[PDB]
Symmetry: D2
Subunit: 427 residues, 4 copies
């Protein structure tokens, strides 16, 4: 036998919950003994999840606010970090659209296999690790921490409390820093800005949030748990069993058996308060980018919970200039941070940048061929003064790093890559 | 017992070989009976592989030339077709860098799992199929053919003839139209524009081209087979056993057992000639974008095989404006076309478009937050006159197509997505 | 543009629904035109799905009955067919237990990723195809059909109607012949012999059966659709919306909002009758093997639907000796077949055979080392008289088939595998 | 900003290499600073790989010998440990045959995707972890260590030194304890007991072993590195470049350029000695299970390398009773153990166990239906005396464990699985 990965005792775990300020405003309805009972004889260490979660928590407290863009590939996350961004957002919508394990293009309705997001978390972490390895051998100290924390989409958990548990565990195994969970019926899940949304009862989402925390505790990592409510626009709910939901129930039913419910900020606020003890961050989806509406939500929840941090989705599902002038747009995130919205993210940033940049290049290329590509390459060259490095694509993906591996195994290797390359001679 | 998928007879196959103009200049050193014995009692129909290969072959003869850009995600290929391109190039380098089944970022050295490119082939077809389905329910006739032919990188085959066979079979099952195969040692494979390259003997590559043809024949599809030679810059070869290679052997050997060999256009020309009976297209990697060297290579091959189509890599591994003036860049592809270069491609187009667009957005975002994203969204709106559609990301990704499935199953469904979406109300 | 895989006209499909006996007893609530609307410009052929479904249907009408054993690996399926079986069962329980895409061991509660069963379907077809390729090379006419139809577990569809649709589509792409769908809540799905089952409303299961059929129609293949009811033991239902369900609802609720419902054969019979127009086979999960209960169910259904075929789970979750005697155990399937149970299967056969054989082997090995193994080898030699071939393991996994590919490419290869093998010299 | 996962200093690594008896006679031709240079800013902890490798190294010394059977599924490994076995062997031949990521059935020729064995390593560890978790909840302490060390097949590394590096790294991420590497040309790899084998030069294999050690060092885990030579039967070698290989070169060549070499125990002992400073265990492939040949190989090695442990493949490719008597067969492993073979394993145990046990059942089932199955269920019942537990399949697979998760999350949950089960009532 062995002591490696020996689980902590329940008293040690209790001590930590009582001692670490991380757990100041955090309610667990299960016991430390319950956690240990689920741990077996060996607890795998999850370095990147631990490191990420701790970094993320400090950033939410140390910065004015943390903003992120949705990344759907590893290289996308690398560029975000290279450009000075300090956190990464992993969008389930983007995974459905262009990066899931079925191989298919889907709308955002939880259609893809449930291990799809964990795979992209692991991909993003691998890509940042490579960027980190390359920087080290290059003596590049331009970025202090390549392993920026990742906050990923847990959707509606793909089923019940057990599905939620397995997803959080998978996300942790892959190195996630934070995960979010929404109070929608999993079998009818929608993007927050699609219609046809169905809520589940308040208590059912507390079970989800409890389940997400249990998985993190059993995995012995301080995963940041975010609760999201879709009650601003959802006109349906699965059941009227929960007394907290009954005030918005209208009596009318649909043919499927769903109850109609009165949507808006009011049930969002009540839901936020109920989730607060079980959420590190709280997020309500909205129909418009509106600062007053955000202030309204923020005030009401902080009245009850002064230190409860909030999250906001600066969604590309909004037509921004339709609703806001350049001046409000420019100050949007700053104002939001003043209200307690400490995590802010553009969910579909990667989808749009990728689709637009390839459309633009392919269109020019269709008309003018190489002239069109040369314009991009020249922009890349120009971008180097900003810190862009990917013009030299070979070193960017690690040709220099694997040369070092190769010469470590055999210094006189005849088959190394960078020496004699066009990159060496032309860039 | 059934007659679904029953194998043809050798006689039928032979007739096909004798009379189909597709096979005019194709040498097969195995028998039609050999093919049949490999087919068991059922042959699966590969619709996309068949359709793609037939469309590709006609475009090569119908169009002045077929050009393409490297796609590494499904959405990229969609935007390329939407912008008017008629074929998709699937780059092994890009798969190594940002889209392979290990989840890691790699340089272009055949490090990733051998089913990686096939998986991307299937993804790209899935994505094109989605765009096709959406076009049909939207009444969108702007794109003539959504299922553009995919030409994919078979690298050095990941081993010997059998690994080659299995890779070609997997590409076909995934629906590939064409595949290219290079005369390097698989265990030391490099991007053409990296150094450290090791050639295999001429006959070993003829064996590769034979295996790739054989897999296509057994799968019963007219897959376009592309032969690539890396002799312009490789200074090593695994063996001097082949008399056609001996004139360039120097005599010196490395510690690995590799022979030094004289690189340049001369051994490329000879190899291209030995490969011609086994290749629908021939491609030589070169160190610069140069019409004269292209002309030189084209002239010499055509003098011996007048109907031999060629392929040219318009590589991002070149510093284009360091080597050419804007006038020469503007005419490059049409000039190449005139010489017989019928398939032309920018291998790493995807990697650069993706990396540069995200660096630029993230950089802007870091300084201006929402102002930076809105500039992109506005550029997207502006692009609609050119044919861009992804600004409406919900329908782009099939929300309307799935709503159609939903209402087909249940016309009274209360939970369809687009009705009441912010997309519908703001776009 | 091309003719390959062009979709049929609505008129043509209608013609088939009208005139093909296959659809005699089949209700479709959507139209032929709805099917065409969803097929885009190109319809992929699915040879193995078509062949298997056609073959399965014929067998259901020819043989007294069709039985099968649950297979979780490809070799297992190969051996089942070798041993003379005519169909393969693909258990979701077994996939959860030992063959799903998360890599984890799960209980049967829809915990694993939704593309796990399609991947095993594809695996089993690949394995059978290799067995079929090898036979055609060894001139083995022993087995008449290596491509036995596969019937696969669709569970509760992993969510809503769209999740169901996507599962069926992926099952078909992998070459499934038939699929079964059960009337449970997916977020709380259970093995039928587990407790805590929650039913869905009758109409919701008709929605599922409809979705499964629609995916088959869109994919243009006559997949066998199987309807399963879990009403014998389930005491919970999600809603009281459906009038057909209301007679069993007690009026008592749970804290989650579920409704208590009266379980037993009576609701199973009512549900079966409701599912009948949408199901090629109907299957009632039961708590004990009981020829009497089976006849009761069988007679009640046939009274309304005389030609409705049924299916029966001979479940290892039963203690067979606690309930029955040797004489009846021997007649069991034959008697069921006379009541109209035309498809019969042992769900967990593979789990038990694999787990037991390995335990027995390992146990002996621990105390007796090589003696224990040598014994297994002897039985394998013995079993050769009954048709077993796996003792010559090299040729069993295709060493000779691949040698043939190798010599097809190059007859003079010095790197063939079987020549010089210890299989050639010791066997 | 974090110090979690900060790598050790060169000096600390150096100290471990100097003083820790683990690294006693281990040559590393690279430096401690070379290792650190490759580690980036963060080193991920690999709990199961560290634990397994440490445990395995101890067992190899504390125990008389360590023996193992090839496992190819997770359940298979659980039954091996349950039966008292102390280590698990992961066969590449078995992955090729029935458990690789292409989904196809293959002969043992390195045809499958290179990440296939790592996936089975992860699966096996997951399976053992589940069993550990259940046993802890059931108070079963009959197995002291559920997480038995896993020794895995690295084959010929799927290419060059960098492919070896990545395979070893993936094996470690998955939790491997040891890995073996053979001196064949990957592009022509064969199972040891097939023919058509090709050796690579001695120094090339040293490169392989050095790369495998480097990956383990960079990953900071004491992975057990095993070298295998295939020189006993191989009559071919890629090159005559290595002077240690020249004595066996005959001078004859093939049309492929390979060199004919004299096979036998002679080059095996020479290669064993060359590999010894780079291998924790040495393994020689034999034509027959002969104790005398093993004595001859062993003695020759210990005379120069006294502490060098050895490994032996008790292979099903041998017809065992065709060579040995029941008296020797029974003493075989004990005898080998004396000679210095502390690791012995049956490569294809799982294959034969699986294929036979399922052919047996399916064959009975085809004649006798349910009678055949109950025969099996009766044996499983009979085995609960020896410790067999899979009869109660629900608990075996985690039903009780997930019930505990469910009740921890919500003690009032009315949808738990075991209460009301047939397992709770019939077993
Ligand atoms: Mg989302
Ligand atoms: Mg809180
Ligand atoms: Mg390439
Ligand atoms: Mg099932
Ligand atoms: Mg092996």
């Amino acid at each position: 036998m062995s002591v490696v990965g020996t689980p902590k005792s329940a008293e040690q775990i209790q001590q930590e919950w009582d001692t670490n300020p991380r757990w100041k405003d955090v309610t667990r309805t299960y016991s430390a003994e319950d956690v240990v009972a689920l741990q077996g004889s060996v607890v795998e260490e999850h370095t990147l999840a631990r490191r990420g979660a701790e970094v993320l928590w400090e950033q939410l407290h140390d910065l004015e606010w943390v903003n992120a863009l949705g990344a759907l590939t590893g290289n996308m996350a690398v560029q975000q970090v290279r450009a000075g961004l300090k956190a990464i957002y992993l969008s389930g919508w983007q995974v459905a659209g262009d990066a899931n394990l079925s191989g298919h293009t889907y709308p955002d309705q939880s259609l893809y296999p449930a291990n799809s997001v964990p795979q992209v978390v692991r991909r993003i972490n691998n890509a940042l690790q490579r960027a980190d390895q390359i920087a080290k051998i290059e003596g590049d100290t331009s970025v202090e921490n390549w392993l920026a924390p990742i906050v990923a989409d847990g959707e509606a958990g793909f089923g019940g409390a057990l599905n939620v548990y397995e997803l959080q565990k998978a996300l942790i195994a892959a190195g996630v820093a934070g995960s979010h969970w929404e109070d929608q019926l999993a079998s009818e899940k929608k993007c927050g800005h699609l219609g046809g949304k169905v809520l589940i009862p308040t208590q059912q989402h507390i079970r989800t949030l409890t389940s997400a925390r249990l998985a993190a505790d059993v995995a012995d990592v301080p995963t940041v748990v975010i609760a999201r409510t879709d009650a601003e626009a959802a006109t349906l709910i699965t059941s009227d069993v929960d007394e907290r939901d009954q005030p918005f129930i209208t009596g009318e039913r649909t043919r499927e058996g769903f109850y109609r419910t009165k949507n808006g900020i009011e049930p969002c606020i009540a839901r936020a308060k109920a989730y607060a003890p079980f959420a590190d961050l709280i997020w309500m989806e909205t129909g418009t980018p509106d600062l007053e509406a955000a202030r309204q939500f923020s005030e009401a929840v902080k009245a009850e919970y002064p230190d409860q941090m909030l999250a906001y989705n600066c969604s590309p599902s909004f037509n921004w200039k339709k609703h806001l002038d350049d001046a409000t747009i420019a100050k949007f995130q700053k104002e939001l941070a003043a209200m307690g919205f400490k995590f802010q993210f553009i969910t579909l940033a990667g989808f749009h940048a990728l689709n637009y940049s390839m459309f633009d290049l392919a269109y020019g290329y269709a008309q003018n061929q190489m002239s069109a590509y040369v314009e991009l390459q020249e922009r890349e060259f120009a971008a180097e003064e900003r810190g862009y490095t990917a013009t030299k694509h070979q070193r960017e993906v690690g040709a220099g790093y694997f040369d070092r591996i190769a010469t470590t195994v055999d210094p006189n290797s005849s088959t190394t890559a960078l020496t004699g390359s066009t990159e060496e001679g032309q860039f």
